[PDB]
Design a protein around this motif. Structure first.
Motif, PDB file in Angstrom:
ATOM      1  N   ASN A   9      -0.872  26.074 -88.643  1.00  6.17           N
ATOM      2  CA  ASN A   9      -1.008  26.818 -87.398  1.00  6.17           C
ATOM      3  C   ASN A   9      -2.136  27.835 -87.491  1.00  6.17           C
ATOM      4  O   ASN A   9      -1.983  28.996 -87.102  1.00  6.17           O
ATOM      5  CB  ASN A   9       0.306  27.500 -87.033  1.00  6.17           C
ATOM      6  CG  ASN A   9       1.498  26.576 -87.161  1.00  6.17           C
ATOM      7  OD1 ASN A   9       1.493  25.467 -86.626  1.00  6.17           O
ATOM      8  ND2 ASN A   9       2.522  27.020 -87.882  1.00  6.17           N
ATOM      9  N   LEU A  10      -3.286  27.417 -88.013  1.00  2.00           N
ATOM     10  CA  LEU A  10      -4.467  28.264 -88.009  1.00  2.00           C
ATOM     11  C   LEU A  10      -5.284  27.990 -86.750  1.00  2.00           C
ATOM     12  O   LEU A  10      -4.878  27.230 -85.869  1.00  2.00           O
ATOM     13  CB  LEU A  10      -5.293  28.051 -89.279  1.00  2.00           C
ATOM     14  CG  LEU A  10      -5.824  26.658 -89.629  1.00  2.00           C
ATOM     15  CD1 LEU A  10      -7.263  26.440 -89.165  1.00  2.00           C
ATOM     16  CD2 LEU A  10      -5.716  26.429 -91.126  1.00  2.00           C
ATOM     17  N   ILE A  11      -6.455  28.612 -86.660  1.00  2.00           N
ATOM     18  CA  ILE A  11      -7.278  28.541 -85.458  1.00  2.00           C
ATOM     19  C   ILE A  11      -8.727  28.322 -85.871  1.00  2.00           C
ATOM     20  O   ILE A  11      -9.239  29.014 -86.756  1.00  2.00           O
ATOM     21  CB  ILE A  11      -7.114  29.812 -84.596  1.00  2.00           C
ATOM     22  CG1 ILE A  11      -5.834  29.718 -83.755  1.00  2.00           C
ATOM     23  CG2 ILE A  11      -8.314  30.047 -83.687  1.00  2.00           C
ATOM     24  CD1 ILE A  11      -5.445  31.002 -83.054  1.00  2.00           C
ATOM     25  N   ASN A  52     -10.971  27.923 -83.081  1.00  2.00           N
ATOM     26  CA  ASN A  52     -11.551  28.036 -81.743  1.00  2.00           C
ATOM     27  C   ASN A  52     -12.960  28.614 -81.800  1.00  2.00           C
ATOM     28  O   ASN A  52     -13.820  28.205 -81.014  1.00  2.00           O
ATOM     29  CB  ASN A  52     -10.624  28.900 -80.862  1.00  2.00           C
ATOM     30  CG  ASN A  52     -10.943  28.834 -79.350  1.00  2.00           C
ATOM     31  OD1 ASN A  52     -12.087  28.755 -78.913  1.00  2.00           O
ATOM     32  ND2 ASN A  52      -9.887  28.859 -78.546  1.00  2.00           N
TER      33      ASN A  52
END
Lengths: 79, 55, 487
Positions: free
Chosen positions: A55-57, A59
């Protein structure tokens, strides 16, 4: 030894460790051996890093710029 | 199950309210958080190991 | 008589229980700032016992047991203390029941020899040298360290060093005497070599020829001094004979080879290395055959030691070492040339190589092997209980008292691994009484199972020597009944 890696995070790596000390003392006051608490802390952290990495990012690409310019804007809030 | 995108709702570091972070741009590198959790667990394990003294 | 024996019992039991939690690999570390500032953070109880301020006699005899067990097998240092302390604690019931300590001590001797003969045939012995199971014991020993990535770097080197000289020492067992060891700071960990003969690490820097096929060797310990009479005659003797590689000692004074005699010894450019290490000097002489002679008039023609290749050679690119082959009887202590740029890859490599030495000498003095980790102690506590049931007289409880005192080694292994100790111990007893010997407590995963599948195994002579030494000191402390100061 934490301080030579990333810089900050020193107060967090002290405070979380101290709360682990406190809750481990509360556990071993209930006739629990510290071996079990140490292995439980180890398994908890080994599971928690896989929880983090699922559940990292990412973006902040070259396409992620509105979030980036919003990061820039909220970093200088109330000025 | 559908509200997986209520996950990064962290604390406002200025005024202290439940707030977005991904839209707000509040970010921290993952290697920093992972290494801090690792070293905190190592410190906790080492000081819990020094146990067997009436002292 | 009894009031001093009880104090011996209590002091030895208290000094045994101060390291009792440190049994096993999950044995927790200590901290005793007794004395003047000892930050004693270590999980191993041997160095805890070596720093314990001990004033009592019976508390000091277990410190002697620690070094004795480290000399005999090198492993099980805390076990010989915990077994002895539990035995001496169990002697108090026999004392208060009415048995004299002589009967207690001789019944412990009977229980000791019964336990040795019970352990010696319940093993899984090796039949040949069996280098595969030597590497298996290396995986039990040389791994679980920082030399775990240096395990294949270090185990077959020593295995091949014993393959070279299966040396006739204590019924062709591994001595400390295979092929002489050195160690050099710097280099990589892969820069270890297996040599044939003498190596020197110190810095000889000769621009001329030190590379002689008939490298004649002497040990002149006469360095130069300051008042010409007792100065140049050894160099004139060098010009007589021609000893082209000679190890220098500064036993006389500090200006070892001054330029008067140094250019005299650089007109033929002899090997020059000073301040040679005293315990390895006699091993160097056992290698070479020359005589360790400082009197320059005692330099004779039969002092000419033999050497084949002697070079100040940059081994592994830059290490200017002096390796020597072709001697009278070389080969002094098993070669692992410990090279490492880091310091921890020096000290842990050499310490683990000494661990490998003390286990392969354990594997071949007695050529059997058991499943370690609490299983033979439960086996002894069962079979000795049956034997004490068969045994008559006042000894019938004492061997039984020998049996229950054997049970502290699994229970601590049950306790230090976090399990409920008493229930896991008697469940191990119920499993062993109808099943197998090898059932025990796998501490490496924390659970009671068959250990020979989970592979926590040890050579037999560790357990036999620990039981022998513990019973010997328990016997002695029971026989000790008087002390007196003021000579």
């Amino acid at each position: 030894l934490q301080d030579k890696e990333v810089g900050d995070g020193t107060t967090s790596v002290v405070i979380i460790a101290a709360e682990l000390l406190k809750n481990a003392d509360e556990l071993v006051k209930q006739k629990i051996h510290p071996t079990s608490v140490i292995s439980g802390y180890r398994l908890a952290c080994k599971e928690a890093v896989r929880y983090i990495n699922e559940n990292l990012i990412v973006n902040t690409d070259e396409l992620g710029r509105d979030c980036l310019i919003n990061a820039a804007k909220t970093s200088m809030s109330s000025k | 199950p559908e509200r997986k995108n209520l996950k990064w709702i962290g604390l406002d570091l200025s005024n202290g309210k439940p707030r977005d972070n991904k839209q707000a741009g509040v970010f921290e590198p993952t290697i920093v958080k992972v290494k801090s959790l690792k070293f905190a667990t190592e410190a906790a394990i080492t000081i819990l190991r020094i146990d067997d003294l009436i002292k | 008589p009894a009031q001093i024996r009880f104090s011996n019992i209590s002091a030895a039991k208290a000094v045994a229980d101060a390291i009792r939690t440190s049994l096993g690999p999950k044995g927790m570390d200590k901290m005793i700032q007794d004395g003047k500032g000892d930050v004693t953070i270590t999980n191993d109880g041997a160095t805890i016992l070596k720093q314990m301020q001990v004033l009592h006699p019976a508390a000091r005899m277990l410190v002697e047991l620690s070094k004795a067990q480290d000399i005999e097998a090198g492993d099980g240092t805390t076990s010989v203390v915990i077994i002895a302390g539990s035995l001496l604690d169990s002697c108090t019931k026999l004392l208060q029941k009415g048995i004299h300590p002589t009967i207690i001590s001789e019944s412990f001797q009977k229980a000791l020899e019964k336990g040795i003969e019970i352990l010696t045939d319940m093993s899984r012995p090796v039949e040949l040298s069996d280098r595969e199971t030597l590497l298996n014991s290396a995986t039990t020993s040389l791994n679980s360290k920082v030399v775990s990535q240096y395990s294949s770097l270090l185990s077959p080197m020593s295995v091949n060093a014993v393959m070279k000289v299966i040396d006739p020492a204590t019924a062709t067992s591994v001595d400390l005497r295979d092929i002489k060891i050195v160690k050099k700071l710097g280099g990589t960990i892969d820069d270890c070599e297996l040599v044939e003969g003498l190596v020197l690490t110190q810095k000889v820097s000769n621009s001329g020829i030190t590379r002689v096929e008939k490298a004649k060797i002497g040990l002149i310990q006469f360095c130069l001094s300051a008042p010409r009479a007792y100065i140049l005659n050894l160099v004139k003797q060098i010009k007589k004979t021609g000893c082209n590689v000679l190890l220098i000692q500064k036993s006389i004074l500090r200006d070892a080879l001054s330029d008067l005699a140094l250019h005299f010894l650089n007109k033929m450019k002899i090997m020059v290395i000073k301040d040679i290490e005293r315990e390895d000097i006699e091993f160097i002489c056992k290698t070479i055959g020359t005589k360790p002679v400082a009197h320059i008039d005692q330099f004779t023609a039969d002092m000419l030691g033999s050497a084949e290749l002697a070079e100040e050679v940059n081994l592994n690119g830059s290490g200017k070492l002096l390796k020597i082959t072709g001697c009278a009887s070389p080969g002094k202590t098993v070669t692992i040339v410990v090279r490492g740029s880091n310091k921890l890859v020096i000290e842990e490599a050499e310490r683990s190589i000494h661990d490998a030495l003390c286990v392969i000498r354990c594997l071949v003095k007695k050529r059997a092997l058991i499943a370690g980790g609490g299983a033979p102690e439960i086996e002894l506590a069962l079979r000795l209980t049956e034997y004490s049931r068969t045994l008559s007289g006042m000894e019938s409880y004492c061997v039984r008292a020998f049996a229950d005192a054997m049970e502290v080694i699994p229970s601590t292994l049950a306790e230090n691994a976090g399990l409920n100790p008493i229930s896991t111990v008697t469940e191990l007893r119920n499993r062993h009484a109808q099943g197998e010997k090898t059932a025990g407590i796998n501490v490496r995963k924390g659970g009671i199972s068959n250990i020979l599948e989970e592979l926590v195994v040890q050579p037999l002579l560790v357990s036999v020597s620990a039981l022998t030494l513990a019973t010997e000191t328990v016997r002695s402390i029971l026989k000790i009944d008087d002390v007196v100061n003021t000579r």
